[PDB]
Design an enzyme around this catalytic site. Structure first.
Site, PDB file in Angstrom:
ATOM      1  N   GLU A   1       0.384  -2.229  -8.728  1.00 30.93           N
ATOM      2  CA  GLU A   1       1.568  -2.535  -7.940  1.00 30.93           C
ATOM      3  C   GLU A   1       1.880  -4.021  -8.050  1.00 30.93           C
ATOM      4  O   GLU A   1       1.003  -4.859  -7.820  1.00 30.93           O
ATOM      5  CB  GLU A   1       1.344  -2.133  -6.486  1.00 30.93           C
ATOM      6  CG  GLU A   1       2.594  -1.960  -5.677  1.00 30.93           C
ATOM      7  CD  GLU A   1       2.305  -1.350  -4.329  1.00 30.93           C
ATOM      8  OE1 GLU A   1       1.129  -1.023  -4.076  1.00 30.93           O
ATOM      9  OE2 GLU A   1       3.241  -1.201  -3.517  1.00 30.93           O
TER      10      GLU A   1
ATOM     11  N   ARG B   1      -1.349  10.812   5.729  1.00 28.79           N
ATOM     12  CA  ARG B   1      -1.322   9.475   5.168  1.00 28.79           C
ATOM     13  C   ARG B   1      -2.030   8.422   6.005  1.00 28.79           C
ATOM     14  O   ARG B   1      -2.180   7.292   5.532  1.00 28.79           O
ATOM     15  CB  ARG B   1       0.128   9.045   4.933  1.00 28.79           C
ATOM     16  CG  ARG B   1       0.913  10.022   4.086  1.00 28.79           C
ATOM     17  CD  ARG B   1       2.386   9.945   4.375  1.00 28.79           C
ATOM     18  NE  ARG B   1       3.005   8.828   3.681  1.00 28.79           N
ATOM     19  CZ  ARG B   1       3.533   7.775   4.292  1.00 28.79           C
ATOM     20  NH1 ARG B   1       3.517   7.699   5.613  1.00 28.79           N
ATOM     21  NH2 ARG B   1       4.078   6.796   3.584  1.00 28.79           N
TER      22      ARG B   1
ATOM     23  N   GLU C   1      -6.130   9.680  -2.382  1.00 29.11           N
ATOM     24  CA  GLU C   1      -5.514   8.618  -3.172  1.00 29.11           C
ATOM     25  C   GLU C   1      -6.025   7.268  -2.693  1.00 29.11           C
ATOM     26  O   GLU C   1      -5.277   6.487  -2.097  1.00 29.11           O
ATOM     27  CB  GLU C   1      -3.992   8.689  -3.067  1.00 29.11           C
ATOM     28  CG  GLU C   1      -3.402   9.954  -3.644  1.00 29.11           C
ATOM     29  CD  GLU C   1      -1.910  10.053  -3.440  1.00 29.11           C
ATOM     30  OE1 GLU C   1      -1.338   9.200  -2.734  1.00 29.11           O
ATOM     31  OE2 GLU C   1      -1.305  10.993  -3.986  1.00 29.11           O
TER      32      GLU C   1
ATOM     33  N   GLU D   1      -4.599   1.602  -7.613  1.00 30.00           N
ATOM     34  CA  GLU D   1      -5.007   2.952  -7.242  1.00 30.00           C
ATOM     35  C   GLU D   1      -5.061   3.821  -8.487  1.00 30.00           C
ATOM     36  O   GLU D   1      -4.101   3.852  -9.256  1.00 30.00           O
ATOM     37  CB  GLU D   1      -4.048   3.566  -6.231  1.00 30.00           C
ATOM     38  CG  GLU D   1      -4.214   5.054  -6.114  1.00 30.00           C
ATOM     39  CD  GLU D   1      -2.974   5.738  -5.618  1.00 30.00           C
ATOM     40  OE1 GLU D   1      -2.080   5.046  -5.096  1.00 30.00           O
ATOM     41  OE2 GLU D   1      -2.881   6.971  -5.772  1.00 30.00           O
TER      42      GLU D   1
ATOM     43  N   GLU E   1       0.259  16.380   2.767  1.00 27.33           N
ATOM     44  CA  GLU E   1      -0.355  15.069   2.611  1.00 27.33           C
ATOM     45  C   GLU E   1      -0.401  14.388   3.968  1.00 27.33           C
ATOM     46  O   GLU E   1       0.639  14.194   4.598  1.00 27.33           O
ATOM     47  CB  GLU E   1       0.416  14.218   1.610  1.00 27.33           C
ATOM     48  CG  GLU E   1      -0.134  12.825   1.448  1.00 27.33           C
ATOM     49  CD  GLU E   1       0.770  11.933   0.637  1.00 27.33           C
ATOM     50  OE1 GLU E   1       0.287  11.279  -0.307  1.00 27.33           O
ATOM     51  OE2 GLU E   1       1.972  11.879   0.943  1.00 27.33           O
TER      52      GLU E   1
ATOM     53  N   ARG F   1       9.669   8.863   5.382  1.00 26.92           N
ATOM     54  CA  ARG F   1       8.393   8.265   5.036  1.00 26.92           C
ATOM     55  C   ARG F   1       7.851   7.349   6.121  1.00 26.92           C
ATOM     56  O   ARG F   1       7.075   6.441   5.820  1.00 26.92           O
ATOM     57  CB  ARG F   1       8.476   7.516   3.701  1.00 26.92           C
ATOM     58  CG  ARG F   1       9.347   6.285   3.635  1.00 26.92           C
ATOM     59  CD  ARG F   1       9.346   5.806   2.189  1.00 26.92           C
ATOM     60  NE  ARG F   1      10.076   4.563   1.963  1.00 26.92           N
ATOM     61  CZ  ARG F   1      11.374   4.483   1.710  1.00 26.92           C
ATOM     62  NH1 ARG F   1      12.115   5.581   1.646  1.00 26.92           N
ATOM     63  NH2 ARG F   1      11.932   3.297   1.512  1.00 26.92           N
TER      64      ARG F   1
ATOM     65  N   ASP G   1     -38.504   8.128   4.024  1.00 23.71           N
ATOM     66  CA  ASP G   1     -38.633   7.501   5.331  1.00 23.71           C
ATOM     67  C   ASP G   1     -37.241   7.240   5.887  1.00 23.71           C
ATOM     68  O   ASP G   1     -36.519   6.375   5.382  1.00 23.71           O
ATOM     69  CB  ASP G   1     -39.427   6.201   5.238  1.00 23.71           C
ATOM     70  CG  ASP G   1     -39.616   5.537   6.586  1.00 23.71           C
ATOM     71  OD1 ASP G   1     -39.832   6.262   7.579  1.00 23.71           O
ATOM     72  OD2 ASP G   1     -39.549   4.294   6.654  1.00 23.71           O
TER      73      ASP G   1
ATOM     74  N   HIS H   1      -4.290   8.518   1.217  1.00 23.50           N
ATOM     75  CA  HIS H   1      -3.575   9.741   1.540  1.00 23.50           C
ATOM     76  C   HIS H   1      -4.349  10.939   1.022  1.00 23.50           C
ATOM     77  O   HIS H   1      -4.875  10.916  -0.088  1.00 23.50           O
ATOM     78  CB  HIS H   1      -2.186   9.724   0.919  1.00 23.50           C
ATOM     79  CG  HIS H   1      -1.389   8.500   1.239  1.00 23.50           C
ATOM     80  ND1 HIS H   1      -0.239   8.169   0.560  1.00 23.50           N
ATOM     81  CD2 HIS H   1      -1.572   7.531   2.164  1.00 23.50           C
ATOM     82  CE1 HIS H   1       0.251   7.046   1.052  1.00 23.50           C
ATOM     83  NE2 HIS H   1      -0.541   6.638   2.025  1.00 23.50           N
TER      84      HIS H   1
ATOM     85  N   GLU I   1      -6.873   3.519  -2.421  1.00 20.67           N
ATOM     86  CA  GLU I   1      -6.346   2.292  -2.994  1.00 20.67           C
ATOM     87  C   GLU I   1      -7.300   1.148  -2.715  1.00 20.67           C
ATOM     88  O   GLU I   1      -7.948   1.105  -1.670  1.00 20.67           O
ATOM     89  CB  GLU I   1      -4.986   1.951  -2.425  1.00 20.67           C
ATOM     90  CG  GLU I   1      -4.129   3.143  -2.164  1.00 20.67           C
ATOM     91  CD  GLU I   1      -2.762   2.759  -1.686  1.00 20.67           C
ATOM     92  OE1 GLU I   1      -2.437   1.561  -1.745  1.00 20.67           O
ATOM     93  OE2 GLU I   1      -2.012   3.653  -1.246  1.00 20.67           O
TER      94      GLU I   1
HETATM   95 NI    NI Z   1       0.692   9.433  -1.223  1.00 23.57          NI
END
Ligand code: NI
Ligand code: NI
Ligand code: NI
Ligand code: NI
Ligand code: NI
Ligand code: NI
Lengths: 435, 435, 435, 435
Positions: free
Chosen positions: A179, A326, A130, A187, A324, A306, A51, A236, A132
Site C-alpha cells: 500500500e 473486519r 487477511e 498484506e 467478512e 464500508r 515442563d 479481516h 496485515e
Molecule cells: Ni477485507
C-alpha cells in the site's frame, strides 16, 4: 499424512533436529528442539514430556508436567535454520488421561470444530483471514522509571521472497497488497482452509514475515496501531460453512445470502464484545477501533457500506458466499479468535438470532438518532474483558471453553492492561505537564 | 499478441511472479503482484478483483471493488526484480458491466482513440513525445512546521545502459541528448507510436530512468523545474494523423502542412489552457512556463520562430509531416495529456477552427502592440484548473471524459495547489522577513 | 502476434539465421535460410522471391518465381540448430496478384477455413489428430536393378525429451502412449486447435520426433505400415465445429450428438474414397487398411463398435462433443487431409446427407448379408486416385481446390504408385519363383 | 496422504512428468506418462481416460475406455529417469459407475481386504514376502521355427545400492541374503505391511532390482527356475491376522499358534492347488515344485521339518506369530496371489477347517504308506488351472473374484501353457532324436 512419511522425510532430507512448536494463550509460539535420532515411530504415540511453566494459564500452581503430542501432518522443513530442522506443531495433553489440555489454544480450536461437526449444523468451516503487517527500517523503544521513548524509522524483493518462503512452508499465496498511501503496510493473501489448519497457517505466516524481514535488515510488526494517524493493521476474517460440499451461506436473501448465514451474522453481532476480548486482545488494538472513517466499529452488515464491521463480499459464484468480519486484528491468537467467532456464529444459528436489517447507506456521518442506537464494538480492553467475564456462556457450549481457561486468559490479559493503565505517557506530558 | 503466448512466456522464462500495473489520475504507477501459478487462461477474461482506494477519483465513497483486466500485448519481463517477474499493464473495469472505468486514464485514452476512429476524421494518430529528465548525484528536501529546506547536488555509462534497458523493455531508442549547458539534463529519443501505446512506453521510460539512476547511486527527476534559473524539463509532443496509411497533416500550405493540420493547430490553440490543466498539472510546471527566452508560452505556430509553443518541424519527406506542441511537461499523465491534445485537435478539425497566421519572426522581444494581443498558456495552476472547469465541452465529445472524472481530477489537483499556496517559502523570508 | 514482436525476438535471442519453411503437396517440409540481418519490417510485406522447382504441382512449365510470405505468428526458435535460428512458416503467393498459390497446401487450408466462415455453417473448426510413429534402433533398405532388401532392428528418456522439445516449440502435450504390445510404436497426445494451426503443429510434431530420434541414435517413421503383421501407424482425427463459442456437434441424438454432426458424418462417409486419396496417399497406407480386426475400414459410425471407421467418443461434457475418423494415416499432408475432411463434412451439412444408422454391435465378424453391403474405404491407391478424379466436386466448393491443383496432385501420386506397381517384390519371389 | 501434498511435492521437486502405473493380470507393470502441468487438484477425482487394450481380460470385445484413478499416497520420485518424474500407482475404474474394475488386480486386492474387514474375522492382515532373484552377467535366448537356444553367463556394490534405491522409494529393507552355494541368487528382506501396500512394495522391489541390475550391466530375473539343477527362486509369504492390535495367530497350541491360525492353515491346505493357479502361474514354476530335497511341495505344516510347504517360524515374541507358506514364486502377480492366499485362509476360518496334525519329522524320505497319502501342490500348470476352474467358490466369497475375471485369467494363462506345450525342446532332441 501419517508418521511413517515423517520418518521417511527425516531420512530423506538428512534432518538433524526436530522443532516441536505450540502456542501460548498469548499467541506466542513456543518450541522445544530435540535431535532427529530421538524421533522414532513410538515418539508419535507418547509425545514428549514438557515442563508447563509457560506464561499464562499454563502456570498453574498445583500441577505436574504436560505432554507434547506432535501432529505429523504439520511437518515442514524450516527455511531459516542452518542445521536442517523439521518443524512439527504439537498439542498439549494431560499426561494421565492423554486428552487435550483445557488451556491449550490448539486443543480449544479442535474442540470447537468437533462441536461444529457434533451439532450437525454444518460439516466444516472455512476461514480466510487477511493479516496485515508493517515493515519498518528501524525502531527503538523503551520505558524506564525516569521516562519512556519510541522511534520508528520507515522493496519488492522482500515481498516477493516472503511469498516464496511462504510457499516453501506449505502456504498457498495468491497476492501481495503493498500500500502506497500509509506506506510500510503490507498484506499477503492466501487460500482458505478450515479453522485449525488456517490458524496453523497464520502462525507460519507470522514466522515467515518476521524472519524474512530480519534477514533484509527490516522489522515487521503485526501490531494493530504502530504509528499515529496512519491506518492500523487489521485481520479481516471470511467465514463460510459447508455441509456435504455446499455452502450454507449461499441463498436468496440480501446479497444472495442464506437464512443460516443471517443467523450466523446475528450471533456474531450479539456477542461481539465478548469476541472482542479474544479478537482484539491488546490495548493498542483499540487505538484502531475508534469511530471515524473506514473504522470497522459499527456492529451491522452491508455489502455496500464500508463503515459496517461485517461485510458481505459480492462474488460471481454461489460456491463462494462468505461473510467478512473486519474488527479482528493480527495481534489475536488465531485459535482462540477463530474459536470465538465460530462459537458466536453457532450460538446465533442455534437460537435463531436475527441480525436485523442491512445498514447499506449509513456511514459514520452521525445520523440524528442512529449513531448512538447502533451497537458498537468494545471501547477499551477493560470493557471487552468485563463483557467476556459476563458473557462466558456462548463459549462454554459443548465444553469447548472451560471456566478455568477463560479465567486464566482474562487474568493474563489484565496483568498487561494494568501495566499500560498505570504508566504515564508522553502525550500526557505534552497536554498536562503545565496544567 | 494473445494470452496463449503470455502463458508460453511464463513457462519459457520460468516466471515466478506477475506484476499487474495501472496508472492513477495523478499519473503514478500502481501495481499488484500475483504468483505466476495464479495466471491461467481464464485469468485473461475475468481479471483480478481490486480494492479501489487509490488516491484521486478512485476514492469514490459509494462504490465496491474494480476489476484489473490485463492487456496481454503489454507483457514484458522486469529487468530490475531479482525474482523473475512479468509485467502486464491492466485496465480498470467496472465489475458488473465489465466496461472501462470512467476515472481510468488508460480507458480514457482508449476511448479517445475509439472516438477518433468513430468520427471518420482519421484512422490512427501518431504521438512522439520527448520527455526530459534531470540526473542528480544527491538531494535532500523537507518541510516541517518550523521551516523548509531543499538541497540538490549535481556519465556515459548511465545513459548508455538506460538505452540498453529501454530496448530490453520493448522501446525503440534512437538517440540520447545529454546537454552540457544546463548540465544534468538528459533526454532519450524514441520512435513514434499510437496514443495509448506511446503512453505505455512513457510509463516504461520513466520506470527505467528512475531505476537505472537508482542503481548507479543517482536520482532522476521528471519535474518541470527542479533548479533555479537553469532550463526546465519539457515534453514536446509531435502529433500526426493517418487515414489508410497517409498523413492528413501533409499538404501544400505553410511549411508543406495541410488544411486539416491547420484546423488541428487551431483547435489546440483555442483550448490550450484547458489542455494546460492536464499537460501542465503541477504548480512547479508554471515556473518554466514563464515568458522569456526559449519559453514555449506564445500560442502560435511557426517553423522558424522558437518562442512559439507550436512548432512545425521541417522534414525532407511528406510521409513525416507533424506538428510539435512544446508546452507539455513530463509531469503530465501521458494518457490524460495525450487524450486532451487529441480531443482539442479533433474539436478544431470538426469546427473548422482556423489558427490564424504563422508568427515566423516575432519572438518575446515585446512588439509594441502584439505582446499583450497574442494568446498565452495559463499563468498558474489555478487559472488552468478554472479554465478546465469552464471549458469541459471539448473533452466530453463522444463521451471520452465524464463530468464526474473531470471533477475528481480537478479536486485532486486542487488539494495540492492549496498545500503549495498556504505554505511560506524561503524566498519570501529572504524578501519579506524585515519588511 | 505481429512482425514487431518478431524483430524484438530477433534482437532478444541474438538470432543469426531465419529459416522460412513451407510444405510441398507431398507434405515434405522445404526451407530457405536467410541471415537475420536480411529480416526487416519491410520483409513481412514483400516476402522473399523463390524459385518454384519443388517437386509436384510447383514444377509448372510456364511460370516464373513465387513469393514466400512469412506468418509472423508462427515464429519459434529451432532447438536443434547450433547457430540460433528462428523458424517461420511461410505461404506461397503469386508474385503479381500477391494471392495464395493454388497449389499451396497451406493456402488451401486457409481457403477451406475461410469458406467455412463464409458459408455461415460454423465459425471455427477444431481438429485434434493422433499421429503415431515407430521408433527403431536401426534400418537399412534399398532396391537396385538386381534385387531389393529391407531390414529393421527394433526408452523413457527419448519419449520424455520429445515431449519437452515439443513444449519448447509451442505445442501443448498432454500424454505419451508408448505401447508394449507392438513394441516400438509411440504416440504423443496434444491439445486441439483450429485446422491450419493444428496442421502447422503436426509439421512441428514430425520435425521434433525425427530429430530427437536422430540425436539418440534411433530412427522414427510416420509410415503407415513399416513392419509385417504388427499393427500399423494411424492418425485419428477428432473434428468439432463451433459457432459463437458452442459446439454444433452437441445435441440429443445418438450418443448426445447433434443433427448437424450427423450430416457431417454423412458427408464424410459419402466421399470417404475421394478423401482416402488425400488422407491415405501412399501405397503402404493400404496395407493397414485391410479388413480384419481393429482395422478402421467400415464406413459407419458407432460409439461402441471399434471396427467402424468413424467413432463417437463418450465425454462427460457437452462442450467436448466431437467425431473421430480413424482411417487417416500420418503419411498424409495435414493441410490437404484436413481440408478434404472439412469439405466433405461441409458438403454433408449443405446437402442434408443422412449417414444412416449406427453400427453399434456389428464388427468384421462377416454378417451373412451385411459384410458386402456396408461401404468400405478404398482398397488401393489407384482406386482412391480414380475416385478423387471422378469426385472432384465437393473439393471445389468455394474455390478451395482448383482442378489444376487436383490434377497435379493426382499425377504426382501416380508417378509413385506406378514405381511401386512395376517393381518385383521379394514376397513374389517367395511365392512364384518356382511357379 | 492426500492430493494436496502431492501437488506440493510437484512444486517442491520441480517435477516435469507424472508416471501413472498399474498392473496387468499377468503382473506386468503398465504406465502412462503425463506432463506435470496436467496434474491439478481435479485430476485426483476424475482420473485419466485410458484405452483398455492391455493383454488379458482387459482386452474385452464389447467395452469402451477405463479410468486411471491415482492413489495419492503412493507417490514417489523415480530414481532412474533423467527428467524428474513422480510415480503414482493407479486403480482401473469403470468410467460410468466409477467403481473398481472387475479384472483389475489392485482392485481385487482392495476388495479382498474390504471383505476381510467386513466378515469381522480380523481387522487387518500383515504380509511379508521374500522374493528371490538371480543376477546374471549376460543371457541370450530365442526360439525360431528351425530351433531354440538359451545361454546364461553368471558384487557387493550392486546389492548395497539396490538396498539404497529401495529405501529411496519408500521400502524399509532390513537384510540382503546373497547366497554362495547356488551363486547368483539374491534376496532382500523388507518389513511387513498390509496386503495391497505390500503388493505395491513388491512391484517397486522388482522395478528397482531390474533397473539397478541394468545400470551395472547385469540382468536380474524373478523367474522360478532359470537354471538347471541349481535351486530355484521362491517367494515365501508370512501371513498374520490382527484385530484391534493383537495377533489372532498367537495362542497356546502347536508352536504357540492359535486356533484361528490352525483353521487358516487348514483353509490354505485345502485349496492349495487353486491357489497354485495364481501363486505359481508359469510352467517354469513347476520345475522347482518337484518332489525332492528342500522342495516346498508337501501340503502340511511343521515348525521343524523343512519339506513341508507351510512353515511356522519360532519367534521369541507373541506379537510376531505368523505362518509362512513357501510354494509361491516371484513370478506371481502379488495382488492376485495375496488375495488368493487370504481368501483361502478366510474360507478355512469360516468353515472351521482343521488342517490335521503337524508333520514334524517326516521329510521326502518316502515313508512306506505316507508319501502318496499326503496332499501335494499341483504338478503342472494345466492341473492347477483345471483345479482353479473347478474350485472357483472360495475366491468368489464376498464378490472379490468375478467368474468373468477368473475365466479371463485362466484363458490368458492357457495361451502360454499351450505355446510351451507345443514347442519341441532341446532336451527332447538329446533324448529322442535317435529313438
Ligand atoms: Ni477485507
Ligand atoms: Ni515472445
Ligand atoms: Ni522538440
Ligand atoms: Ni483415437
Ligand atoms: Ni513429502
Ligand atoms: Ni522364508
Amino acid at each position: 499424512m501419517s508418521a511413517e512419511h515423517v520418518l521417511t522425510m527425516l531420512n530423506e532430507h538428512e534432518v538433524k533436529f526436530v522443532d516441536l512448536r505450540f502456542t501460548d494463550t498469548k499467541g506466542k509460539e513456543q518450541h522445544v528442539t530435540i535431535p532427529a535420532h530421538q524421533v522414532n515411530a513410538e515418539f508419535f504415540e507418547e509425545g514428549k514430556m514438557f515442563d508447563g511453566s509457560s506464561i499464562g494459564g499454563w502456570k498453574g500452581i498445583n500441577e505436574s508436567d504436560m505432554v507434547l503430542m506432535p501432529d505429523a501432518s504439520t511437518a515442514v522443513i524450516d527455511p531459516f535454520f542452518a542445521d536442517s530442522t523439521l518443524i512439527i506443531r504439537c498439542d498439549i495433553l494431560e499426561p494421565g488421561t492423554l486428552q487435550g489440555y483445557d488451556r491449550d489454544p490448539r486443543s480449544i480450536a479442535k474442540r470447537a470444530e468437533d462441536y461444529l461437526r457434533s451439532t450437525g449444523i454444518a460439516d466444516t468451516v472455512l476461514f480466510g483471514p487477511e493479516p496485515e503487517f508493517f515493515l519498518f527500517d528501524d525502531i527503538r523503544f523503551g520505558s524506564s522509571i525516569s521516562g519512556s521513548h519510541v522511534a520508528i524509522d520507515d522493496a519488492q524483493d522482500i515481498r516477493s521472497e516472503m511469498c516464496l518462503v511462504m510457499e516453501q512452508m506449505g502456504l498457498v499465496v495468491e497476492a501481495h497488497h503493498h500500500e502506497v498511501a500509509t506506506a510500510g503496510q503490507n498484506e499477503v493473501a492466501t487460500r482458505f482452509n478450515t479453522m485449525t489448519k488456517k490458524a496453523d497457517e497464520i502462525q507460519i505466516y507470522k514466522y515467515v514475515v518476521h524472519n524474512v524481514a530480519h534477514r533484509f535488515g527490516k522489522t515487521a510488526t503485526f501490531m494493530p496501531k504502530p504509528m499515529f494517524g496512519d491506518n492500523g493493521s487489521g485481520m479481516h476474517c471470511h467465514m463460510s460453512l459447508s455441509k456435504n460440499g455446499v455452502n450454507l451461506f449461499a441463498g436468496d436473501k440480501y446479497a444472495g445470502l442464506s437464512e443460516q448465514a443471517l443467523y450466523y451474522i446475528g450471533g456474531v453481532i450479539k456477542h461481539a464484545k465478548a469476541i472482542n476480548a479474544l479478537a482484539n486482545p491488546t490495548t493498542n488494538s483499540y487505538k484502531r477501533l475508534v469511530p471515524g472513517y473506514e473504522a470497522p466499529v459499527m456492529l451491522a452488515y452491508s455489502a455496500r457500506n464500508r463503515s459496517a464491521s461485517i461485510r458481505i463480499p459480492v462474488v460471481s459464484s454461489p460456491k463462494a458466499r462468505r461473510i467478512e468480519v473486519r474488527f479482528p486484528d493480527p495481534a489475536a491468537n488465531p485459535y482462540l479468535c477463530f474459536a470465538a467467532l465460530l462459537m458466536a456464529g453457532l450460538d446465533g444459528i442455534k437460537n435463531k438470532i436475527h441480525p436485523g436489517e442491512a445498514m447499506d447507506k449509513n456511514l459514520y456521518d452521525l445520523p440524528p438518532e442512529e449513531a448512538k442506537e447502533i451497537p458498537q464494538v468494545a471501547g477499551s480492553l477493560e470493557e471487552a474483558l468485563n463483557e467476556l467475564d459476563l458473557d462466558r456462556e456462548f463459549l462454554k457450549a459443548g465444553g469447548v471453553f472451560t471456566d478455568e481457561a477463560i479465567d486464566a486468559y482474562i487474568a493474563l490479559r489484565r496483568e498487561e492492561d494494568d501495566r499500560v493503565r498505570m504508566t504515564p505517557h508522553p502525550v500526557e506530558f505534552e497536554l498536562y505537564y503545565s496544567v
